[PDB]
Design a binder for these strands. Structure first.
Ligand SMILES: O=c1ccn([C@H]2C[C@H](O)[C@@H](COP(=O)(O)NP(=O)(O)OP(=O)(O)O)O2)c(=O)[nH]1
Ligand SMILES: [Mn+2]
Ligand SMILES: [Mn+2]
Ligand code: NA
Length: 327
DNA sequence: CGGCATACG
DNA sequence: CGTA
DNA sequence: GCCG
């Protein structure tokens, strides 16, 4: 088992679901308390279990697995022996965890805002609604639309949504393309949102594209919320439903075709996979990776990539298709 | 012990 | 600060 | 919380 998640395939479904879910609760709790290091270790341990070829049945099977020390091993031990980890259950039922989860789930609220609200004594969505002058416009949208945004987006919704985005994109710039990224590209059947990456085959033609796309979607009556030169938009869209509609979160990102492989790689995720890939790049290869490119800080040069395959090769990693990036 | 990804709105 |  |  290699130590970085980008060095091993991680499928969407696996053989240690219960164990990984428990470790991810502890990760989430760590994040709520501002401990990014502990969040990372718990996420990485969870991901290791996702990458295993069969279920862990005995504690000895954790011996020599990366990211399993005393704490993570004890969590697994208790789950294997009793079907439940007391620490995890204590977290699940803490007022602190439940409220931080509720608040951070709101579009426009992060850990820092949630924590302040918690310290101020606020606990429920109706608590926030009763003092709305204190909310940003983004948070007001997030709170108004919270119920719809809490409903999973279905893979069967994505097709009709991509069609409307393509129509707007084609008027904004003929020849521009729309590629489905995010979790759906990794094979997820549901999502919290839909992520689309937009480019044009002629380098430079994509400049100024996103405002044009957004103004057109807005004129079609499809945009319940967006922030508005820019290249990423975090929207709430009106999606048709039987006799009605629902609000869904849609992310649009534009990249030049030169950068498209890097943007596709970054936006396809998973989040942990990309963190691990960027960590690997810098720490093991001395190269700086982001969603725009891959920089050699010695040569002061950028790697031209024509594909995701190119990027994996340049980093000395075996290629993983999107379905095996579910770290 | 230091480090923990790296951007844009 | 929020967001991916 | 863990690797390195
Ligand atoms: O902090 C982040 C968040 C997202 N990303 C990348 C990876 C992620 O898979 C992708 C899309 O982000 P989403 O928040 O939409 N998550 P995803 O599509 O993987 O799952 P879902 O939308 O179902 O929660 O953007 C990062 O690199 N860093
Ligand atoms: Mn997504
Ligand atoms: Mn998204
Ligand atoms: Na949030």
């Amino acid at each position: 088992m290699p130590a970085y998640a980008c060095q091993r395939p991680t499928p969407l479904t696996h053989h240690n679901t219960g164990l990984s879910e428990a470790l991810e609760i502890l990760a989430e709790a760590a994040g709520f308390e501002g401990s990014e290091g502990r969040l990372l270790t718990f996420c990485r341990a969870a991901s290791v279990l996702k990458a295993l070829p069969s279920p862990v049945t005995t504690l000895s099977q954790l011996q020599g697995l990366p990211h399993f020390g005393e704490h993570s091993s004890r969590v697994v031990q208790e789950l294997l022996e009793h079907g439940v980890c007391e620490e995890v259950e204590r977290v699940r039922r803490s007022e602190r965890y439940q409220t931080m989860k509720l608040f951070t789930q709101i579009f426009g609220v992060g850990v820092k805002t949630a924590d302040r609200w918690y310290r101020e004594g606020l606990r429920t969505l109706d608590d926030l609604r009763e003092q709305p002058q204190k909310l940003t416009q983004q948070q007001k949208a997030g709170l108004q639309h919270h119920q719809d945004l809490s409903t999973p987006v279905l893979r069967s919704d994505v097709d009709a949504l991509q069609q409307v985005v393509e129509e707007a994109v084609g008027q904004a710039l003929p020849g521009a393309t729309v590629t489905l990224t995010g979790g759906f590209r990794r094979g997820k059947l549901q999502g919290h949102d839909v992520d689309f990456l937009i480019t044009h085959p002629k380098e430079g033609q994509e400049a100024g594209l996103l405002p044009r796309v957004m103004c057109r979607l807005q004129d079609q009556g499809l945009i319940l919320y967006h922030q508005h030169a820019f290249e990423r938009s975090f929207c709430i869209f009106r999606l048709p439903q039987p006799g009605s509609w629902k609000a869904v979160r849609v992310d649009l990102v534009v990249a030049p075709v030169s950068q498209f492989p890097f943007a596709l790689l970054g936006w396809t995720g998973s989040k942990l996979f990309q963190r691990e890939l960027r960590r690997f790049s810098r720490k093991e290869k001395g190269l700086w990776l982001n969603s725009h490119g891959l920089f050699d800080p010695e040569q002061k040069t950028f790697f031209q990539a024509a594909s995701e395959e190119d990027i994996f090769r340049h980093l000395g990693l075996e290629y993983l298709p999107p379905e095996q990036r579910n770290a």
